[PDB]
Each structure stands twice: as structure tokens, then as C-alpha cells.
């Protein structure tokens, strides 16, 4: 049964989670950096090998709703593999997987703990014997295993992909590469590092027995709240400002970037299109168009795209309609995904997929599964990509992925 406590007399998210994560085969921690969710099931999970939309759909009716604050009032948490898009679009099946990942894995919490930071209250609907007491985060040591597409290999597919762009078969396509490491230790360590270096509103740690998704998502795929869908296309990056001055000079670099705006416009149009598949005609709007969003480290051009979901639709329909994000695939999306299957060496698996929840009240939220570490049995994979365009430099693009991976390398302790 339920008990609200003072955040002050409780432990903290990570603290209470150490114990839970180590005690159960299935558990997860979601953190906004507003709310913190700790949830785990005592009955195992759902391994989806079929169309996730169909499968998940049959679990929505019996979902018990919890009396807690936040968009998630009970329901199911899990991830959608990037390859789940194969059920929703025609994509060549040429390459093999890096590791074996079901199309999606979800679970419905038997116990939930919600931290309402803004209110100093933690809601505990859980059968908890002790609160914590499991010692500190263990060490986590890795050792390089392999890499998929070194500098010149990646550089050449970027060159290949460029022909398609010149010919007019894509405007932009995202090509990615990865490093895999074998490991030993406490994976919690990875999250600890991520929360530290790259905090974000989309922090997550999902443990599905032998598999893990530990990341700090930089972008939200979509959100559904009381039948209104919203997504925020992001494009263009600039570091924050030394002063209230150097800051504006950067923010204005974005504002004047003919290039960064063009890519953003396309993403917005792509976003309005995907919402267009399930929203009521005339409701898809862009309330806030091309505004610079300032983050604790960088800043990007951002837009707010919303729409009203048709009554005949689900959050699952929003998922399939928006998946995978334009920023992790390309445009035109169908072509781009096929070109990706053509150029990359392995099927992406959870990478570039999405992770989030379906509330028992129909509300939902899914973040893009990037800037994330995917652990599957003996292997751990850090994956990143760069969006290629008509005048993209193969080498510059290589480095964007290197730069992106450096962060994950750090989070995992390689540096």
C-alpha cells in the first residue's frame, strides 16, 4: 500500500535504487534533471518478438493506475528496438545484428517509488522490507572488444551516402559507428558518471536481467498528455556562454546559421508530418518555431510541434508514427533507413530506438535511445552517429561520432 514521505527523511533515488537493482532481475530508474521513478517487477518482463504495437496493445486494458504525481501513474516501462520499425515500414534485411535484442522489452512495475522533488515528497507504493543498506556502487572495469567501422571505412560510406544525396535520394541520412567492450563490475557506475557529466531530463537505467540500457537521452521522441501529442525537433549546437554576453554571441550564431536552420526546418516539417499521420486535421501546429534552447553545457535551435490525437488512436500509434526519430534516421525517412541498412555493417538494435513508458492513463513519453550504453550479456556497446548532408565532410562527420563516443567512453570509465 501507499505512503508519502518527506524527501528529506528518505534516501535519494540512486541510493534506494542500488538495493533494488541488485536485488531484482527486472528494474529501472528514470530521472528528470522534476521527477524520479524507481520501479521493478516481481513477475519478470515482456520480451516482444512481434509487432510491438499489436503486442503491447493487448496489455493496456488491465494496466492498474497509480495515484502518483508525474506523467507515469503506473503502466509499462521498456524500450523499443530501432529494428521494430521493420513492422511499420519496408526496410531491406541485409545486415546481421551486433547482439541479440528483442524488438522491445517492457515490464509492468509491481512496486513503484516516485520522487516529487519540486514538492519534497517521495511516494512509496511498495512492498519494501528495508530502505537501503547494500553498500556503495561497485567498481566497473571494461576492456575494448571491437569497433564497427574505423575512420576510413566510416569515411567512405559517408562518401557513398553523399552520392545518393547529390542524386536526390535523401536530404540527410544518419550514419553511425560503435565500440564494444567486455566488462566486469557494477553497471550502476556508468549511470553515476552519466548523471554527473551529462545530466539531462531523460536519464534512464533499465535492467532486463541480462540486458541493460543506461543512458542520458538528449532528445524526446514524443509525449502524449491528455490526448495531445508533442515533440520537439532539435537542430544546431553551440556551447553555452562565458558571460551573459559570449552566450548571446553563440546563441546568435545559431540564429544566423543558414545551414543549422535548414536542417531544423526539415526536422520540423518531418515532425509535423509524422504527427500528421495520427492527429486531427488542422490540429498539428508549431506553437514555438525555431527558438534557441539553452542547456547546462550547450544550446540548440528548438521547435515545439503539437497535435491532437484522433480518438481512434493510441500512444502506440504515436510511437509507430514517429519512430524512428528523424534525427537518427534521415529524410525522406523510408529511403534513408534503407540506405542505412545498406551502408552500416550491423542492425542497430536498441540504438537509435527509443525508451520510455505508457501510463495506465493513456499518457506516454518516449526519449530517443542515443547517448546510451547498451549492455547485452558479455558485451557493452557505445554507439553514435552523425547526420550527413549534401556538403558534409567525411572526416568532420567521422569526428562528430568520435566526439559523441568520447562522452560514452568517459561514462563507462575508459577515460
Amino acid at each position: 500500500a501507499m505512503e508519502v514521505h518527506p524527501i528529506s527523511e528518505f534516501a535519494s533515488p540512486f541510493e534506494v535504487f542500488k538495493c533494488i537493482e541488485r536485488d531484482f532481475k527486472v528494474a529501472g530508474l528514470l530521472e528528470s534533471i522534476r521527477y524520479s521513478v524507481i520501479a521493478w517487477s516481481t513477475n519478470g518482463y515482456l520480451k516482444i518478438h512481434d509487432d510491438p504495437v499489436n503486442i503491447l496493445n493487448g496489455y493496456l486494458k488491465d494496466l492498474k493506475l497509480a495515484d502518483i504525481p508525474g506523467l507515469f501513474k503506473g503502466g509499462m516501462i521498456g524500450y523499443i528496438s530501432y529494428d521494430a520499425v521493420r513492422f511499420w515500414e519496408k526496410i531491406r534485411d541485409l545486415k546481421p545484428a551486433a547482439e541479440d535484442w528483442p524488438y522491445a522489452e517492457f515490464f509492468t512495475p509491481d512496486n513503484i517509488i516516485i520522487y516529487d522533488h519540486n514538492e519534497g515528497k517521495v511516494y512509496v507504493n511498495a512492498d519494501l522490507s528495508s530502505v537501503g543498506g547494500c553498500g556503495d556502487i561497485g567498481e566497473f572495469k571494461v576492456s575494448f572488444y571491437d569497433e564497427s567501422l574505423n575512420k576510413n571505412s566510416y569515411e567512405r560510406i559517408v562518401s557513398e551516402s553523399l552520392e545518393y544525396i547529390r542524386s536526390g535520394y535523401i536530404f540527410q541520412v544518419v550514419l553511425s559507428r560503435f565500440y564494444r567492450y567486455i566488462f566486469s563490475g557494477d553497471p550502476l557506475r556508468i549511470y553515476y558518471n552519466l548523471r554527473r557529466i551529462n545530466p539531462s531530463p531523460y536519464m534512464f537505467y533499465l535492467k532486463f536481467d541480462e540486458k541493460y540500457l543506461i543512458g542520458s537521452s538528449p532528445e524526446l521522441l514524443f509525449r502524449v498528455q491528455d490526448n495531445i501529442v508533442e515533440t520537439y525537433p532539435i537542430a544546431g549546437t553551440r556551447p553555452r556562454g562565458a558571460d551573459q554576453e559570449e552566450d548571446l554571441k553563440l546563441e546568435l550564431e545559431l540564429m544566423n546559421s543558414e545551414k543549422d536552420k535548414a536542417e531544423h526546418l526539415m526536422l520540423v516539417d518531418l515532425a509535423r508530418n509524422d504527427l500528421g499521420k495520427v492527429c486531427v486535421p488542422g490540429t498539428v501546429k508549431v506553437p514555438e518555431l525555431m527558438y534557441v534552447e539553452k542547456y547546462s553545457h550547450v544550446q540548440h535551435i528548438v521547435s515545439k510541434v503539437i497535435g491532437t490525437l484522433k480518438k481512434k488512436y493510441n500512444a502506440l500509434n504515436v510511437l509507430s508514427a514517429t519512430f524512428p526519430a528523424g534525427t537518427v534516421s534521415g529524410a525522406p525517412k523510408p529511403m534513408a533507413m534503407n540506405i542505412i541498412e545498406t551502408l552500416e555493417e550491423y542492425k542497430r538494435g536498441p540504438y537509435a530506438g527509443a525508451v520510455g513508458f505508457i501510463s495506465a492513463d493513456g499518457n506516454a513519453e518516449f526519449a530517443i535511445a542515443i547517448r546510451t550504453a547498451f549492455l547485452n550479456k558479455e558485451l557493452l556497446r557505445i554507439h553514435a552517429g552523425a547526420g550527413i548532408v549534401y556538403d558534409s565532410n567525411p572526416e568532420s562527420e567521422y569526428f562528430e561520432t568520435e566526439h559523441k563516443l568520447k562522452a560514452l567512453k568517459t561514462a563507462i570509465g575508459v577515460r
Binding site: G168, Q172, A262, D269, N273, G276, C279, P281, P334, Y390
Partner: protein, 195 residues
Amino acid sequence: MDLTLIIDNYDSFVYNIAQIVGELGSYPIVIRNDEISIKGIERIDPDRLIISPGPGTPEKREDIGVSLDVIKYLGKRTPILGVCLGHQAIGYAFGAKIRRARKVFHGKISNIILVNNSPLSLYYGIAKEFKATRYHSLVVDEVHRPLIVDAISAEDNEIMAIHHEEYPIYGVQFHPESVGTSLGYKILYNFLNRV
């Protein structure tokens, strides 16, 4: 009831067209260039037809599918609006040439300059020159009859729009469904109600 058939050339902007169409009071049916036959289209008997943007060139059939026969056969008695790939297909369909553009507008906003000698229904109430988004590496050229050039790119100077001497066939290189095209909605409103 009112029905607009939108041929989807595996596009990521096609639903921006459907939403505007639906909002404009017409029922939109979206189907891909290779999922329906020209006879089947005939059997649905849409009131009008829009050929969506898309990757590729009309010069290659797998790129446009049934799109070129639709223009050729149905274009005379059913209005057609081609956008990007569709605008090119409409041009290709009537002997125009397809080539790369001098400048590449991918998500870039261009200043369209209407250069119509005689007034057009599709451009009713539209400013002599307006702003519109462009998403294309290729353009149409060597446009001769029965086709007529209607708009032009200010900066680039490429054909931005065309139409048939007598058939209710129209092509726009730019994107009316884009947030970047202010008057886009109006242009579509025109196609639905005045063409």
C-alpha cells in the same frame, strides 16, 4: 463526398498535405506510387489528385511508380497538383527535361516569383512573389508546350512552377505543406476550390 487522392512517393512530407486537405474539407486518401493501379485509381474516382514529393527522378519509373500514367491519362479530366517529384513528373510527362539544380535547396526558403502572363486559379490572391521552402537537388528545364512556366526562383533562377495549356495539371517545385511557406495553405485551398 469530396475526395482527394494523394499518391505517396515514399515521402516524409505527404501527411502535411493530407492534413491540409482534410482541414480544407476534402477527404484525403494516401496511397503509394506502387500500391494501386491506374484503373484502380479510376475506380475510386477522386475529385482531384495530388502527387506527393519524393526521392529520385521521374526519369526512373521505380521512383514515381503509377505517377506518370496518372498525369498522362487522368490529367485531362481530373485536376492534378504535383509537388517536388510530382512537379518534376508533371514536367517530364510533357517533354520537359530533368536536371540537377545550379544551387541545392534542402530545407532552404526561396523567393518564388510568379511570372504568369495570364491569371491562374491556383495562384488566386497570391502575392506576386512570396517565400516558400525548397527540398530538391533537381529541377525541371526546357519547358515547352503544352507546359507553361508559372513561377521562378529569385536567387537560383530555376523553374519553380508550371502548368498545362489546357489540362487542370499544376506543378510546384516548392513546398506548400511546409511551415516555411506562408501562403502554402492558400495555394492548396485554391487547388481544392478553384481548380
